Amino acid sequence: MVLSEGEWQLVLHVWAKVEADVAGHGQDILIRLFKSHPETLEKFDRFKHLKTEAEMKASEDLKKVGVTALTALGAILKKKGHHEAELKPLAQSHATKHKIPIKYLEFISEAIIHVLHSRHPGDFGADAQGAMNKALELFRKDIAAKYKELGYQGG
Numbered sequence: 059m060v061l062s063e064g065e066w067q068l069v070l071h072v073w074a075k076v077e078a079d080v081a082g083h084g085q086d087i088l089i090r091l092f093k094s095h096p097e098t099l100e101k102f103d104r105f106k107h108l109k110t111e112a113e114m115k116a117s118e119d120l121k122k123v124g125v126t127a128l129t130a131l132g133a134i135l136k137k138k139g140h141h142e143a144e145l146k147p148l149a150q151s152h153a154t155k156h157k158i159p160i161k162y163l164e165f166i167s168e169a170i171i172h173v174l175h176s177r178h179p180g181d182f183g184a185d186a187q188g189a190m191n192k193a194l195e196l197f198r199k200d201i202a203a204k205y206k207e208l209g210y211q212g213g
């Protein structure tokens with residue numbers, strides 16, 4: 059399934075650690091994204107009054123958005139590449155409604171790997187990082203193809 063079975067197992071092993079605290083992981087990933095690439099914050103209209111990390115962590119709205127997003131990503135990862143039916147609506151909303159370039163999906167992928175390694179280093183070594191990188195690369199490639207199918211280059 060594009061990745062090897064062993065690679066998918068490493069992806070899902072670390073994902074199980076994410077699932078012990080989806081809300082906290084989602085908050086940390088978003089905060090890391092906004093800190094590393096501040097232009098991404100402009101895409102979230104309801105979060106622009108959040109000026110500090112503590113304000114972001116206190117926002118129930120932001121926490122809920124993060125949980126919804128990681129839940130969708132987890133459902134995609136669990137399909138081990140067989141994710142067309144789950145990925146198509148996500149592509150539609152992110153291309154046409156939120157207007158998210160593929161580069162921003164690279165930025166959030168970086169943030170995901172950063173948070174996963176920060177929290178779970180003993181379960182996220184080099185081989186697991188490589189597997190997760192391949193899984194997110196596949197996600198980004200397939201969503202870029204769906205963007206094009208909808209008439210969006212995603213640049």
Ligand code: HEM
Nearest residue numbers: 098101102123126127130131148151152156158162163166
């Ligand atoms: C792993 C990558 C991502 C996943 C799995 C994901 C998933 C989701 C899901 C499931 C939703 C709720 C339904 C929807 O509107 O589609 C959502 C909302 C949204 N996403 Fe993403 N997303 C990702 C990346 C991004 C990035 C990188 C940005 C911006 C830099 C972004 C911006 C937004 C915005 C603005 C919303 C609307 C939130 C709201 O108003 O409630 N997404 N995302």
